[PDB]
Amino acid sequence: KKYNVCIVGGGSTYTPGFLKSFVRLQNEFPMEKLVLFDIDAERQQPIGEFGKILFSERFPELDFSYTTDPAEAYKDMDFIFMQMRAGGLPMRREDEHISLHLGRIGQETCGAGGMAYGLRSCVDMIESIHQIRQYSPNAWILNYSNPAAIVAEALRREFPDDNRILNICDQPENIMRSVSRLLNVSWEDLDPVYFGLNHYGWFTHVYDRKTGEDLLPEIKKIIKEKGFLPQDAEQRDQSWLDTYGFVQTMMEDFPDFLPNTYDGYYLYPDYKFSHLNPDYTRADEVIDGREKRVFAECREVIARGELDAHAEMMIKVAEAIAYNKNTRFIVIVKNEGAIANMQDDAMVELVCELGINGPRRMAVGNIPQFYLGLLVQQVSSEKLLVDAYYEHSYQKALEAFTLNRLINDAKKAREILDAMIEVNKGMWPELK
């Protein structure tokens, strides 16, 4: 048996990493057809022409194509890999610049910039899934598209009976990968216990696979004396090294659990804002860094005619689904008791077994009071935001902005929200 796969967002900077991963895991994940879909034909073209060269060299049998036609992309598909960026990096720049220029953190998925990106994603994600369901109702939809917490909440309401949609994030695994470098072990030999929302969580235990010993006490010891580095620290930009290195401070103020690196924004908004350049942001770093290198690569290959971890995890998720492996991943799922003292309809992030029938979440119980206050505040802000999407309510958006920890003020919320409405004119829902 071989599988038909479609990548939504074929013009993404991560797509070449997917095409090379499909070649490497060719024996683990047998494919018969691959289609790159995108709404930007010119941005997707050099990536698709690079793939034709690559596939000819290393995957001749595979039938590869790139298109901007939904019918060609979504017909008779087994898996849909979604990695769109609603508004693209130019709008990510506006998310970061305007927030920082107005005295709050500007970030891709957290704060005012994340909720602005969330409103754009709600519109485009719901529109895209409806198209997909028009052609292949039973295809497994694996979504990377951000902001994941907001997208999952909106998709929960729009498709309540759809059981083949899974939102995932690679941050929990990247922390496990960083821990494996800390401990000089294979990251596949770590068994975590994790709870929280997307980009807002903590590891309560880090067990060794073979022996079951809690490695978390030793993890904090090496962090205090040596620090915390990403597993690919040699290739990472300086901003990522600072984000990972900041966990040393976080673990000294809050020593119980190993934190998701995104916790630093919510626990240290003053420090994080103080060290962010308002005129040269992370979106500019990506434009000058990853976007430039990847597109230049591809154009080098097209001109000549001849010729990782992020793309591999989604493929491994597809493998666990297609072959009913029931292996453990940290994915986003509906709560309904898994976190016992939070509401049923919250989209939370937990360890789950993954098979043909979807994620099988494991109960965590009642979380401590300190973390309950943090997560309920955030999940309420997210649910109020998609409330504004469904109700066309400016008032719901204002309450979502005010409640959020990275804004925290009603007058600042209205000031930022009004600025966001103007630049997001044709990409947001109406807010009246």
Ligand X SMILES: NC(=O)c1ccc[n+]([C@@H]2O[C@H](COP(=O)([O-])OP(=O)(O)OC[C@H]3O[C@@H](n4cnc5c(N)ncnc54)[C@H](O)[C@@H]3O)[C@@H](O)[C@H]2O)c1
Crossing angle of helices 216-226 and 171-183, rounded to 10°: 80
Between 78 and 173, CB nearer to ligand G6P: 173
Between 80 and 283, CB nearer to ligand G6P: 283
Between 238 and 369, CB nearer to ligand G6P: 238
Q: Is 169 in the site for ligand X (CB under 6 A)?
A: yes
Interface with ligand G6P: number of residues (CB under 6 A): 9
Give the DSSP letter of residue 106: B
| Lookup: tokens for 197 | 């929302």
Among 25, 89, 287, 419, binds ligand X (CB under 6 A): 89
Nearest by Cα to 187 from 203, 196, 170, 175: 175
Between 49 and 170, CB nearer to ligand G6P: 170
189, β-bridge pairs: none
Task: Count helices and strands (H / E) in the chain.
Answer: 18, 12
Q: Which residues of 249-286 are buried (b: 16+ CB within 10 A; e: fewer)?
A: ebbeeeeebbbbbbbbbbbbbeebbeebeeeebbbbbb
Is 144 annotated as catalytic? no
| Lookup: tokens for 316 | 């491994």
Among 24, 43, 157, 325, binds ligand X (CB under 6 A): 43
Whether residue 198 contacts residue 335, with contact meaning beta carbons closer than 8 Å, is answered with: no
Q: Is 49 in the site for ligand G6P (CB under 6 A)?
A: no
Q: Dihedrals φ, ψ of 63, to 5°?
A: -100, 115
Q: Is 108 in the site for ligand G6P (CB under 6 A)?
A: yes
Which residues from 239-298 bind ligand G6P, rule CB under 6 A? Answer: 282, 286
Interface with Mn ion: number of residues (CB under 5 A): 2
Among 25, 39, 267, 309, binds ligand X (CB under 6 A): 39
Between 73 and 169, CB nearer to Mn ion: 169
**Count of other CB atoms within 10 angstroms of residue 369:** 9
Q: Is 169 in the site for ligand G6P (CB under 6 A)?
A: yes
Which residues from 157-176 bind Mn ion, rule CB under 5 A? Answer: 169, 171
Span interacting with ligand X, options 11-19, 298-306, 316-324, 336-344, rule CB under 6 A: 11-19
In angstroms, what is the C-alpha Rg of the chain? Answer: 21
Q: Judging by beta carbons within 10 Å of its beta carbon (0-12, 13-18, 19+), is residue 160 exposed, middle or buried?
A: exposed
Interface with ligand X: number of residues (CB under 6 A): 28
| Lookup: tokens for 400 | 């979502």
CB of residue 420 to ligand X, shortest distance in Å: 18
| From ligand G6P, ligand X, Mn ion, none, interface partner of 282 (C-beta below 5 to 8 A by class) | ligand G6P
Nearest by Cα to 361 from 378, 342, 325, 337: 337
Is 170 annotated as catalytic? yes
Span interacting with ligand G6P, options 117-125, 167-175, 247-255, 405-413, rule CB under 6 A: 167-175
Identified catalytic residue from 162, 170, 232, 284: 170
Q: Is 177 in the site for ligand G6P (CB under 6 A)?
A: no
Q: Is 110 in the site for ligand G6P (CB under 6 A)?
A: no
| Lookup: tokens for 28 | 């683990």
Q: Are strands 165-168 and 140-143 parallel, antiparallel or unpaired?
A: parallel
Contacts with ligand G6P by CB under 6 A lie at: 108-109, 146, 169-171, 174, 282, 286
Contacts with ligand X by CB under 6 A lie at: 8-9, 11-14, 38-40, 43, 83-86, 88-89, 124, 128, 144-146, 148, 169-171, 286, 291, 310
Which sequence positions are flagged as catalytic?
A: 170, 262
